[model samples]
Target: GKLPPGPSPLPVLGNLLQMDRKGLLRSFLRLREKYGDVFTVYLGSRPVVVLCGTDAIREALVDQAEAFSGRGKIAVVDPIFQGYGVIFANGERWRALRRFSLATMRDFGMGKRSVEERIQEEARCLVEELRKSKGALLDNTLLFHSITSNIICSIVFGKRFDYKDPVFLRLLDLFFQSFSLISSFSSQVFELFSGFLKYFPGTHRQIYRNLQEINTFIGQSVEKHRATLDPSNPRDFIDVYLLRMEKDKSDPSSEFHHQNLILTVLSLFFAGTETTSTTLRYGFLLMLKYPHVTERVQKEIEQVIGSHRPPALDDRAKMPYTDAVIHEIQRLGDLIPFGVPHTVTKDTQFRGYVIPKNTEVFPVLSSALHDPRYFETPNTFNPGHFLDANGALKRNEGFMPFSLGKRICLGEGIARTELFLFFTTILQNFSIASPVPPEDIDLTPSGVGNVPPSYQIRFLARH
Candidate 1:
């Protein structure tokens, strides 16, 4: 076959029937067993090449970076985003936008101590929110969501939302509702014939309206920044982008206009909100299920942070157990296991197959994270996978929760800072548990491709 090895795909429907209805991760894992590392599957009429294991992923994403640099389209996003955002654009436009966004983000304090301080502040606020639960059965979902989303808002809108603020609550509800609606196997099934699916009254229509509200929420902020923006002092990402638009207004080809800015900021807000919060929630859920591990984390925190002080990035080096626990949580959670789809910029030959131009590529991040070759115990949760015999943290190349390569997540630094700080701070100040039995609590995530289900746990203050 000219394409990479895969289960023989059916006509029109492609490999949909062969795929796991619950999760694509297990399906791809199974395919790799039969066809080797690389294989092809079709989503409706689309032919997607699934690449598994570290060697195959690194080869295409790193060694052949430029050839595989293009972003692939998602059917659910067809009418929603229209390729305007940094996540989906191609060629010169994407390159320029990516560069400018990174530069502007740095100017606005991304990857700096200033951004670290914001996350730290939010972590403290998160602690207060958990305190309100008063050791009752508390779902940390929105609490973590509000905190992480506020960090992105601090950069995008130049402010944080009060947890009680109605506007903030409404915005989050809209964003999350639309997200869940679009992130399922059913959504993809609907999209196989999305031509008529868009017109019918259903989740698609509801998602479209919900997204409009969310965009209006974002649009209001962008325009609010526009009216008050001072070129000398760009208050936030919106201000920085608006100023860039003005500077490039005469250049018709400029990609810094309002549409791209809106979508790019939306991308940042959603990605930042969804992934990190889910990791933190899942980590806590694991802690609840494994009290012994939780106590060890607290022990490490007390020794490193000393009950008198809040946890900081500076303290991560000193808290090896806690750090390893966080990594283990992220690995087992398998968030974004099959990463955001990417496309081939041109026809490319790989492992003796000529993948045509624009073929969709799925990088199986979970394969590497859970690969038995690198991890000592890939089937279950164990922090020791990331710990050396010296009781120090061990870095694994397979530890790629953020996805790897040139298109690696842009928010990685801040996300890392948030995870360590929030996790350590909470464990430093609180003792958490679930009313449910430890062994009885199931950690199996919803079959949705990305993210984990939220579970309720009780929180009691230790400090």
Candidate 2:
């Protein structure tokens, strides 16, 4: 009776029939229109509070950030993660790990090399790889994933793998299969009946197997790192974490440990790689759909960055049009629509209702991203969403591709740098070509996280 207003639920199924399984996020948006911003929906008797639009999302996440910082239940990977890593860990563990992670991310490329250098090097490698295609129609899904995963490898392992390295190739394949499985409809069913379904054979089982394989690979990397330790000068994220674990070995409650090390490294790769690469894939696809936008971006790149050199972080400020295009891509891309369900840390009053402690809350990031009040043409692709009449890149509070507040993605900084550098560098070097006409291009994304439709494109090198 104390909960917010929502539709009545049926027996065991609850409100399952009310939702569009294919478009759960869209269903939430529709319900928001009828039930207001704060409402509840049940997934097999599990009541989830859905917060809609920017105002509601900001009110809870920003106004009551701490109380909203608790990680909610993710039945898909919860068993495997065991709440030890930075992404899903709550309370003291999360606090300590998050602090260390932010500091480590800030300290990236301090003396050895800058994160920019690694990305720039990868961009050059990608260009070289594309040059091998000779303007032939080809699908770039594998190429993009390889490059993005390599960037993470450089940060986490302090080394980049050759694109064809067997170990690297295997790991990438597992990550790909795991991501698709975890994001599939079957996985959602597993979430509802995790206990009952675990004993059954399904996609969930395959996901676990894939995770174990990756775990073995990471464990191997850690062993190799331990074999040659230079505590005074750590190599990468793994070495620094190892040093911390050793430093805090005496502490009874320290979160630094072998399990956390493996989980955190896995979390970084899981969170960092696919999201950026998917966005890059979508961005290029959108450009192919709208060539005028691509031409303007390319024109801006030629003027500000010039084809003589690659794009840099500093150049972002000078290229407003290009910046706007990237922002618009993230806005329209709408990846991770629910922003990884958050839970209220404690019983708290919000918008005249008391949401009980640990109640699963959905921030509904897609609602905020496409909020009509903020964006003029919320449904269409418009770079002007991030551009002002004066032609400067404008900041929209509604633009939250990385989410917002305390739980904002830790990879936000690196992801932004990669997006800018990679997007501009590719555009600078080649003209994106599609086998189909711009009007016939299908912009609709399939499945979870706006996974761009698989299509063949030719990269025509610019002389």
Candidate 3:
């Protein structure tokens, strides 16, 4: 069998010289256009199978999901993660951690009422915090960051942090800086030329430094949890995981060790923080760009959720337009554009091409999000892409903002719950206004993560 074909690459450099580091997904899309759905791109000497469009991605990730379930190298975070945690671990380690994680997340009430209450409490706190702003112009990023991080903290640490707490602030700073650095152009260079660049100084160094601090922070939390843990009644995720580690201590092959515990907590905390916060930040930016859309969502909030009480998961079903708005924001936002790279677990045959086992795979999510065949206006911000002729919330299978198959985002449930409650609660409590006209808002995402361009907005309290 033959490997997929693509533009010839240069020695050592591969296609690094030809790629656009700034707009990396744009580079992938351009190559996919020339080479078709499944093509090979050389990220340094390694040949990565890039799966584009909904059909091709589904075939590999969903239809042949098992073969493609393995995690591939993310050069930026690999130094720190080292295939230890649920997010980066592979083979038996991955299976063990993922099973433990999914079970622990449920045991801790991720999709249930307990987690919803935590989100609602945080939403109320955020509303009060914003009310203090008194309609003054503000940068919403860090504020969203605090609330989203607090929710994860509640699940993991059995406590939520004060908005002004120094520890909370420092952890947020670490996550914020680390997320940006991982997606930075320097990190893109590091991804391609990690062998050469790892020896040199750059953002990767800062990331390692950040990881050390994050590890210390998580370690502190773990020690606190370990000291206070109740054997019969686990307090939160960390406590539950600690209990699991204790149970499996006798098994030398068990993945639930001290290292996996700390890194897993860090993975949950970091992943749970950055993704949901950025999505919320970008969703608000989208609202500012489209006042009409915001007005409709606010009106839906008024009808379905009313201003007297906080928004809950139950309200999501009754509010189709608001649901559609959130869906469309995620669709248009295209966060995690490239997705975390996946590898085929074994030598696999797909569409007549043979991808060797452990070959890095890029299931380009941006291609799936913007696939024209699925979305009528893939290039535009239209919530109607998720609405049907009867105005119900229609599900588009191509909405893989979380990617798909077995290795989908571990926090998808919590993230979805937070997105709905936080978004609706904020809109219900305050009406947002941009400092500049809608046309002046630029939604063009630069770099790997598709983070929205930073802007200022004022939130006038609703009476």
Candidate 4:
């Protein structure tokens, strides 16, 4: 019982009562202030270790990778997805599937020449849509969501949906509904008491219903791919996955089955969609907050890529200010502040305390991202935090918008590239206008799933 100390829990509810009302960002910060780096929070008799700062996170997730790489006690998302998806599966299963997924992505040129051109094409199309807005007050939401989801749609299915297709529009709608169902500490509590809570109607009910529709749609897509499957002419992820399932048919221990294949495809879409889109959303919010930052990025885009050409991965190096701005947005935005949960691999001694095997833990990535020990003006939006005195891009050891170690986002490269391409393209084509000036705009996020507040911007297309 040498585990870290934490707030006392009620008999049945556990630590359900105590969570960040605003966002996990403030709550974890307050806990770290009170209890130091390491503490416990029980989600219904389930003790989850919270590792507060960079050192503790590094010691657990990096130095003791095997011990801390283990995953456990996920709140909302995993229960519906069950234990089949890559995000949930652990140990040998995790390794095998991850290995195959990465290899397949590469085979299809995920981070290579073809995908880069495809992303650039999508960026151009996005600008064309913005051109249609005619400088009027526009909701950039649908345009951003459509473009980002289209990239995933292309990679997974090898076909890009028309921006106005009813089926495609419906998919985006379902994804929107699914996004809010995954809202906060209560969902984690639901995970803690799923059996009893499932009978009662509320979050899980709509969540399950919405997910079922999406799952049904995904199942239909799988069948359509099955009809068109050609091993010799493998096209997208589904084609490659189906081939793997067939290859592992005789092996009982193989994780390559039809159900696993379906779940993995779902994992790719589910994980990929919102994170980067939300970042773009915040990036624009930050831009409007600091018009100088927006103008500077536009200046960089014009000088480097020229207004006539779409921005590319190569231009990123020459555009240090714009690059630094995106990094700062990620840091200050604090998206996914409390990253996915992990568990102890074995009974291990850490930081003078014994954390037993399979004890659920959160790396509390925000503790590191926001730690004043690493960044200057930790809570403020300052791109200079990432730039040198001479204005070159500076490297901070703690600039991980993505959490560190092996379990870091599998799509890290793509997400980075996509953010750069999309952000630069939009800025190159238009000026963002708000009802209030940048200084007067309410910067407070709605606190639902930690998303930025809904605000429409007029896309003033600049010839």
Candidate 5:
């Protein structure tokens, strides 16, 4: 089979030798410069096609969802996830799990009043936590992660842990460590050469060990929840899953087994928690860097919804600039640069190229978010990208931070509400200030799963 056009490759390493181990985005951007929006690269001997622009990403994800139904093979994750969860599953299982997950989320008050209230409560706790900082420079990453993860925990586990609780802190550290290890260069190399180096020393072993620890933690949670499950009133995700399993106990086609349940919960734990928190971390940094933008947002909040109470979801309609800033933060941060990859289920034609079955196709989400065609100033942190001249909130067709199509983010509604409530609540109670000059604050992201901005900012009281 003929391959897509790409730069010249070296032996054994293929094109991997030419790519930067750390700067994956920079490498993709450089490839875009040479090969336009649609280019291909070799990861070892495997051919992977990259869709780099808004048009290309949309065409593959929305225009032709059928052709890209198989989530591109993730060798490392495949073993752990076992293609059981929604993220890696394909065909009927994927459809069923996705539908059930969405329905369950809705039933648990996603996109409704109850869920919003829960997020607001978490936001209040976050503000209270920040108040204890007393204007001292601090890392907000774990704090934001705690709040965000707790929101999911409340929804899924029917409980929330204190910030300093040993179990909760351990879980957070495990997640951060796993995320860091998996995205490292050695881990990528391990995936590429897993068949030969399965027992190799270094990051490969560390990644495997971390994965085991995560699985063990999640397994213990599952067992604890199972022992306390109530058939009459299911408390959280575990209870719901157990109920579903009981309902489908006699059926052979049901996928709600113990293993799948554990993996799905872990999937939610990792994906749902990290991305939103990282975005908020960047949001605070951006606010510090562009104080004018932050002031404008605060002024809008003050003028429209006074300080008597916390900012509610309804207030978003009145505060256009605040809405725009949230959207802009997601856009500028570009957390998931490579987006999730999808595989072709059958022979298909994409942009004049015939892609065979099982071929890996990556929708470069960063390209869509930063596409020059859709955004006026793609590189700059401009909230105006989501704001019109009259300061009204505007939606861009290409602004797909959570992605789109059949396998789009399942937790989008919950994430949106959490981000809005947490952001507004924090800004309302405290003003964020950088300890050093704004220029000294590093916007350069760590080459990790969700590339979070680097900064230590003080939270000064506004009330």
Candidate 6:
């Protein structure tokens, strides 16, 4: 088996210079133009294979789940995670943890009434918080983050935090700072040179200190749950795990330990919170950018769900255009361009290239999402991509906001629910419009995770 065809690499540096740092999507698109959908590039000494287009991604990631099941590379924070969580864990550990999390989440009302009640309650609080603003230009990013994080908190700690609480705000800030800093190129370089720079004094040390604080916080929470254990009635994720540990104490193969619990909860925090909030932030911005579309969504909501009543999940069926708008927002937004990378478990032949075992493969999500073959006017914000001839909500095979295959986002269901409920509730109550024109709105994103375009908008009440 031979390596995928790609540009010649320089010593040590590999293809780092060719990578698009500022505009990764644009940079990847250019690579696709030059070398076609499947190509390889070197990051330092490591070889990374990039997969573009829906067909290729489907072939490699979805159809070939076993061959591509391992999460190859993560940012330097791997040590912080400690290979205990589902995201970083591989083989038997990964399978066991994922199964436990899914079951635990379901028991906590993940797809049932228990979870929906929490989301609905949070949605109401979010609306009330916005209403207090009295049409002010509030950065919904932080507020939404609080709401989503609280939902996870409810599942884990069996409680929610007040938005105005100082301690809660500090926690949110810490998580955001950690996420932002860890994804930086400088951080990656530090991880590579961590051993050498142990003597040096800089930001890396501060970051490590902050990470320690986070770990301590998690550890304390675990201990607190351990102190107040009710075997008969488990309250949240912590309690559930504690009970599991008690039951499996005799079994040596059981992975339900305190460390895994801490990392699992942390993984939930890392994976669940930011993505939904960022997507919703973009949803509002897109609505503000296209007021006509916003107004259209409002009209549909009014006709389907009047002002006197709140919108429900079932209402999505009646609100075709609104549903389409949300889908389109996710589609046009194209967040998380290169999702979590998967390693080839065995030598695999794709197209004409033979990728060797342990080779890293990244499903270039943005390409399939914004592919000209799939979406009409891929560059523009068109909701019709999800609408049928009769104007019903049609599912587009190319639309994969949560990604594809075995390693797809775990919080897909929760994220979808939050986006739908929060979005519809906001639109039903307020008229979202930017002070500037739609064309003037910026769609540019930043950082490792998907970010909304920077802009301010006024949300006037409908009544």
TM-scores for all predictions: 0.95, 0.97, 0.97, 0.94, 0.94, 0.93
Residue lDDT tens for model 5, 12-122: 566876676566566777888888888788766777788888888888888898777678656556657767777878888788778878877666532233777878878
Cα lDDT of model 4 by residue, 62-131, tens digit? 8888788777745456655677767777888888878888887666633233666767888888777778
The sequence of per-residue lDDT tens digits that candidate 6 reaches over residues 188-252 is: 55533555554677556666666667668878988887898667777788888888889899998
Query: Which clashing pairs does model 6 show?
Result: none
Could you give candidate 1's per-residue lDDT for residues 1-463 as a string of tens digits? 5999777777777787787755566777777888889998876677889889988998999899998788876666656678877877888878987888777766684333378788888888888887887999877888888898899888888888899899789879888776677777657667566765666766777777776787788898887888887788778788888888888989998888888987888778767887888888888888878999999988888777888777778988888888899899989988788778888989998989989998989898888898888898997999999999999999998888887776888888889999999988887878887778989888877323465656788879885
What tens-digit string does per-residue lDDT give for candidate 2 at 1-463?
4788898988777687777756567778788888998899987778889998899999999999999998886777887788878998999999999999888866654236778888999999998889888899988888889988988888888888787789778779988878888777788777666777888899877887888889888999999999987888888888898889889989978999999889998899889988899899989899999999999998999898887977889999999999899999998999888778899889989988889999999888888899988899998999998888899989887888787899999989899999999999888999989789999998887334657689989999998
Model 5 CA deviation exceeding 4 Å by range: 1-3, 8-12, 109-113, 446-450
Cα-lDDT of candidate 3: 0.87
Query: Which candidate model has the greater TM-score, 1 or 6?
Result: 1
Clashes of 6: 0
Instruction: Please give the range of 10 consecutive residues that has the lowest summed lDDT in model 2.
Output: 105-114
lDDT for each candidate structure: 0.81, 0.86, 0.87, 0.78, 0.79, 0.78
Q: What is the Å distance of residue 237 in model 6 from its true position?
A: 1.5
User: Which ten contiguous residues of candidate 3 have the minimum total lDDT?
Assistant: 104-113
In model 3, which runs have C-alpha deviations exceeding 4 angstroms? Answer: 109-113
Q: What TM-score does prediction 5 earn?
A: 0.94
Q: What is the lDDT of residue 446 in candidate 2?
A: 31
Task: Tell me the spans in candidate 1 whose CA falls farther than 4 Å from its real position.
Answer: 109-113, 447-451
Per-residue error (Å), model 2, residue 14: 2.7
Question: Which residue pairs does candidate 4 place in steric collision?
Answer: none
In lDDT terms, which candidate is top?
3
